[PDB]
Amino acid sequence: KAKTRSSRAGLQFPVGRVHRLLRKGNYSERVGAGAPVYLAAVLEYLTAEILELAGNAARDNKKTRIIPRHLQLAIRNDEELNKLLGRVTIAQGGVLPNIQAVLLPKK
Amino acid sequence: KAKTRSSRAGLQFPVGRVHRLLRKGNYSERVGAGAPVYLAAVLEYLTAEILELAGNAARDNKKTRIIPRHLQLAIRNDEELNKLLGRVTIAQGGVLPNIQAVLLPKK
Amino acid sequence: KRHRKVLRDNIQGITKPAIRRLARRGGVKRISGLIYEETRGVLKVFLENVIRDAVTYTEHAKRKTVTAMDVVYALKRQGRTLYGFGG
Amino acid sequence: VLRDNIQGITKPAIRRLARRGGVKRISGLIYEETRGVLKVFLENVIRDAVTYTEHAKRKTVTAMDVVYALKRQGRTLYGFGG
Amino acid sequence: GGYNLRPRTYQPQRYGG
Amino acid sequence: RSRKESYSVYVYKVLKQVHPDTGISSKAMGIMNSFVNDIFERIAGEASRLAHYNKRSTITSREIQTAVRLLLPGELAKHAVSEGTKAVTKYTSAK
Amino acid sequence: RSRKESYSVYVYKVLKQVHPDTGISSKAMGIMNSFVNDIFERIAGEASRLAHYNKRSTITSREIQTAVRLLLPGELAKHAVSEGTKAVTKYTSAK
Amino acid sequence: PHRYRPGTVALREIRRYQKSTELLIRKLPFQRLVREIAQDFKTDLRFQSSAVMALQEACEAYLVGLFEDTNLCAIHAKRVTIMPKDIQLARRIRGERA
Amino acid sequence: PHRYRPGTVALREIRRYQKSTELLIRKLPFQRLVREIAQDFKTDLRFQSSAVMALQEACEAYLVGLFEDTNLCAIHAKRVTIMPKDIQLARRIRGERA
DNA sequence: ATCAATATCCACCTGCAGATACTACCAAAAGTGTATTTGGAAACTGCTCCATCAAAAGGCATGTTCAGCTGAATCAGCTGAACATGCCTTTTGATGGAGCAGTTTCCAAATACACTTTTGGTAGTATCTGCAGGTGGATATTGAT
DNA sequence: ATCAATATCCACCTGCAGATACTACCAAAAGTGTATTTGGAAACTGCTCCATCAAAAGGCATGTTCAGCTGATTCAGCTGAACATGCCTTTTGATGGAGCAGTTTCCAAATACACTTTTGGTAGTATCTGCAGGTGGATATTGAT
Ligand SMILES: [Mg+2]
């Protein structure tokens, strides 16, 4: 008889949990039915976007397992994700290869 | 025998107001009796610190009425208030007179 | 009705002299000829970003009037908190 | 053969951090300057962390004390909880 | 997969490249 | 021996739709957990401010949407808004 | 004419305590009003979070106090904490 | 006819503008700029006068602050003349740009 | 007898360390430094292992970021050698002081 | 080190704009003082995981030799400051028009709440394998000649 | 050029650390059924924002002129990069107990309600006054000589 609010909304992310985390969070006295559905979809979408590009970067390294380095390379190579995460450190991410042109040897 | 909680605590700043603003602000489910008293006191202390120093800029500039410039000179001339307010713009406050030494003329 | 006169090129209303004065308040003694066009670009980007957020709060409120408070909230979001206009 | 803990942050270690930052050549004064900056960073973050520890009435600094500190210092770290 | 992902992704223009 | 909730189950399912032959390290999964929790906090926080500014007791789909427009850059915002409207469409059409 | 409230009255009291012969323009009063509202939010925000971080549902003077130690620099913290401990102890031992 | 040397009026102007708090952009042009940008986001918008003045106070305090950092960038290069590359190095280090 | 020229091994370390993600400070020295600084705020402290690592991750990412900005401040001055004045300009414009 | 052009200083002298200070005044909010709920400090205890401490291992301190970078001195081109001159556009202070924020009152949806039924997600556990080393040999890079 | 030293690159291999997979147990999501709360829809204000215009300071544009700044060039000296060793510090891996966190218990504290009382806002009115803006005249600064 029971069907998860997620299976109804077409999501892998837990609508039920998002709803509870909104309540136990002191964000507002009340919480509209759709708010946790929307919010769950947004977080899923952004997760797909990152796992998509992290996947591609793992593929380029002849690798099947996404590591933090793959997450860093995807995020910092994307203008929008890099801005969203502009004040965030990926542990064990390292940096993009970048050597200022004038530091390159002459011949 | 109606005492204000401000008088009970020995404060100019309104404890009742502050209790309420903590209520309607959805900071937490519940608010202790002390919280609004401690917070009203702190706010009062800091507004006393600023008005002391701004008063002094008023007098120094041969004036009787504190204007925004007096608040800016007070805040930017105090190491601690300057850090607390380091990401704040004071409308009609201007800046501190300050010329980089190399820009000045002669030898 | 009347319909509003067309608004074009108003960035050029931020004159060389208005930019010189701002540089002076900022401590600047000498100014390259290219600074004026560089500043107009930086100002447009700053205004667009704040206006975009202010208008988002306007639209969410279902109003047709951008309030001081809409700007003050946009400035706070952008880490450019402004004192002296409410909030 | 005893020496300060800060000097435990060695010229070669600082050289490696520089290199990951893309730096080709390094003045000898960099090593002490960098130790200075590091000390302030750790001071400002460990202070906030410890203030969370004290608040929770613990005698152990947790990963979360550090993460919560890093966040309010505008250095949000991902991968240690939160 | 079944997500409306961004068609194109541009890189950020770094100062000094 | 008490429950320590995370998003890992959900991160893993989205991984499989998007890269079905791709795994993910413990450390990488920690980073995606931080990610979800962080954007949760930012969006919920902006939605809370919006409701507070408009003297509203309730965070609806609309506060989430406005919050997403204020917080996501350009194309991310557009696609997030469309994934969000879609999920709320599907869910309002489910007996 | 809907009652819009401020901290003006209290700012002006405290002005009169520290500089008895000093006035304040309405713009300056506008700024002091922004300043109190801003520090209120910052302290209340740290307190909210601090409570959440410790699975508590009550903001006490203990949460305010830690929030003050996180937000104010050294000396302003020290004096703020004194005035707040003093106001609370008093308020309690005045009943 | 007696000329001040280059720099002398520029220093007089630093002293004068650092002493005062009046907005330095003309009110009406700035208001036309706000209206144009807003109109390009949404048509039929009006503005409280205080909304435009808040924008002008925030835009000037931002530009003044940016010129201080820009000037520090020129001087670090051993110049006294700010150039476009100073403003952009400053914005890069402020984290306003990549 | 074959010797690499000045800056040839420097480029190689850059390419090498920009490719890897290992922490570049030896753990024990850093653990000792953490405990020292922390002692001054509350004595008899214990640290979760993950606490210290969080701190080393954050502290290394910070110092690498600062070296990048520092490097841009040196190149801006038409040099290729980072100096205290470069670190100090980067901190000033970032708002970490002055 | 003299002088004159011209900017700046400061003390007088106004007329308000804007501040202060009455009201009277009321409406919403803060306070009062029981009736009810419950969150959190308290005390106990178990079992992680944190500190300590002694063999295994490579990273670093060291001093020398010199490549090439930094910064000093010089110089010429030409950009940007100063300023004089002419005048367009902004500022200012009205008036009239209305669009639209802002209120206050019915409510029919919408969400919270209290209780019960169900199952998704976690924590042990129990297997499976991606890949970090390691080796071998080819080729590219760098710097000497 | 050539020649060699060393770094770098790719293929293959393989042990196990760190994944994926599996299970039962229960906290927490969903289902149902009343229990409250809200957030438009309608219907009016007055506020205030747009508009448009007239007159006049006030600042803007543009052209001329040359002071002095930037940036190219050269060059000497010093200051960091490189590099060859062994020893000293860190890393690794194996035990005792601090103290985190698990949990239940009961009371001091906070909520809920509905009273009564007082504060703080405002509108209105007047009532005062600090200071901006102006104007000389005495005094300072700058740049020619
Ligand atoms: Mg347009």
User: Any idea of the CA torsion for G11, G17, G19, G21, to the nearest 10 degrees?
Assistant: 100
The CA–CA distances, whole Å, from B6 to B25, B31, B36, B37, D58 equal 21, 17, 10, 8, 34
Nucleotides of K under 7 A from a protein CB: 4-8, 18-20, 27-32, 37-40, 48-52, 59-62, 67-71, 79-83, 88-91, 98-103, 109-111, 117-123, 130-132, 142-144
For an interface test with I, give the residue of D6, D17, D34, D35 to mutate (most I CBs within 10 A): D17
CA distance F35 to F32: 5
Instruction: Give the separation between CA A23 and CA B51, rounded to whole angstroms.
Output: 41
- CA–centroid distance, C71 to ligand 1, in Å, is 20
State how far the Cα of C9 lies from the Cα of B98, in Å rounded to an integer: 35
How far, in Å, CA of F19 to CA of A57, rounded? 12
Q: Rounded distance, CA C10 to CA C17, Å?
A: 16
G22 Cβ contact list (under 8 Å, min separation 6)? B51, B55, B58, B59, B64, B65, B66, G15
Contact (CB, 8 A) for C25 and B94: yes
Calculated CA dihedral for residues F16, F22, F27, F28, nearest 10 degrees: -70
B65 touches strand J (CB under 7 A): yes
- Distance CA(F14)–CA(A45), nearest Å, equals 9
Neighbour count for residue D6 (Cβ, 10 Å) = 17
Fold of C10-87: Histone, subunit A (1.10.20)
Residues β-bridged to residue C81 = B88
Flag if I11 and A95 touch (Cβ within 8 Å): no
- Check residues 20 to 79 of chain F and report those whose beta carbon is under 7 Å from nucleic acid strand J: 23, 58, 60
The 3-class secondary structure across chain C, one letter per residue, is CCCCCCCCCHHHHCCHHHHHHHHHHCCCCEECCCHHHHHHHHHHHHHHHHHHHHHHHHHHHCCCEECHHHHHHHHHHCCCEEECCCC
Q: In terms of residue numbers, what domain contains G15?
A: 1-94
CB-based contact, H95 to chain A, within 8 Å: yes
On chain D, the residues whose CB falls within 8 A of the CB of F36 are none
Half-sphere exposure in the Cβ direction for E3 (13 Å, CA)? 30
Q: Is the CB of G55 under 7 A from strand K?
A: no
Which residues of G are less than 8 Å from C85 in CB distance? 30, 34
The contacts of residue F72 (CB under 8 Å, 6+ apart) are A46, A80, A84, F80
Among G3, F18, F25, residue whose Cα is nearest residue F8: F25
- Tell me if residue A44 falls in helix, strand or coil: helix
Cα Rg, chain H, nearest whole Å: 17
C3 vs G34: CA distance, rounded Å: 38
Q: Which two tokens stand for residue C30?
A: 């000498």
Q: How far apart are CA I91 and CA I70, in angstroms?
A: 9
Q: Say how far residue G77 (Cα) sits from the centre of its chain.
A: 12
**Strand K reaches within 7 A of the A37 CB:** no
Residues 21-80 of F with CB under 7 A from strand K: 23-27, 56-58
Question: For chain G, which residues lie within 8 Å of any Cβ of chain D, measuring from their own Cβ?
Answer: 46, 49-50, 53-54, 62, 66, 69-70
The pair of structure tokens assigned to I82 is 């980072």
Q: Tell me the backbone φ, ψ of residue I47, rounded to 5 degrees.
A: -130, 125
CA distance F12 to F32: 10
In angstroms, rounded to a whole number, what is the distance separating the alpha carbons of residues G13 and B13? 9
Q: Which of H18, H20, H23 is the best residue to mutate to test the B interface, defined by the most B CB atoms within 10 Å of its own CB?
A: H18
Q: Which residue of D has its CA nearest to I7?
A: D24
CATH superfamily entry for domain A1-107: Histone, subunit A (1.10.20.10)
| Interchain contact I31–D (C-beta under 8 A) | no
- The residue assigned the tokens 């210092």 is D73
Q: Tokens 């390159």 correspond to what residue? A: A104
Q: Report the alpha-carbon distance of residue H98 to residue H93 in Å, rounded.
A: 9
At what resolution in Å was this solved?
Answer: 2.2
Going from the C-alpha of G69 to that of each of F36, H24, I46, the distances in angstroms are 29, 39, 22
**Checking phi first, is residue G60 left (phi over 0); if not, alpha (psi -120 to 50) or beta?**
beta
Angle, vertex CA H55, rays to CA H49 and CA H61, nearest 5: 135
Each as own residue / partner, the long-range contacts of residues D53-59 (CB below 8 Å, 24 or more positions apart, any chain) are: D53/I42, D53/I45, D54/G66, D54/I42, D55/G50, D55/G54, D55/G62, D55/G66, D56/G53, D56/G54, D59/I44, D59/I45, D59/I46
C-alpha distances out from residue H56 to F42, I27, I29, Å: 28, 51, 51
Closest CA to C15 of H24, H67, H23: H24
Q: Which nucleotide is nearest to B106 (CA to C1')?
A: K142
Method: X-ray
Q: Where are the alpha helices (DSSP H) in chain D?
A: 11-20, 30-55, 63-72
A72: DSSP letter: H
Q: Does strand J come within 7 Å of the CB of I10?
A: no
Strands D60-61 and I46-47: parallel
Shortest CA gap H2–chain B (Å):
19
For the stretch I92-95, contacts whose Cβ atoms lie closer than 8 Å and that sit 24 or more positions apart, written own/partner, are I92/H69, I92/H72, I93/H69, I93/H72, I93/H73, I93/H90, I93/H93, I93/H94, I93/I69, I94/H93, I94/H94, I94/H95, I94/I69, I95/B86, I95/H94
**Distance, Å, I8 CA → K3 C1':** 20
CB contact under 8 A, D72 and G53: no
Fold of the domain built from segment(s) D5-82: Histone, subunit A (1.10.20)
H97 touches chain A (CB under 8 A): no
- Interatomic CA distance for residues I92 and G10, integer angstroms: 37
Q: Please report, for chain A, the start and end positions of each structural domain, with discontinuous segments joined by +.
A: 1-107
C-alpha to C-alpha distance for I71 and A100, rounded to whole angstroms: 9
**Which sign, positive or negative, has the C-alpha torsion F71, F73, F74, F78?**
negative
Q: Which fold has domain I1-98?
A: Histone, subunit A (1.10.20)
Burial of C6 (0-12, 13-18, 19+ CB in 10 A): exposed
Helices (H), A1-107: 5-9, 15-23, 35-60, 68-76, 79-84
Q: How far is the CA of C10 from the centre of ligand 1 (A)?
A: 10
**Beta-strand relationship, F23-24 and A88-90:** unpaired
Whether C79 has its CB under 8 Å from any CB of chain F: the answer is no
Q: What is the number of structural domains in chain G?
A: 1
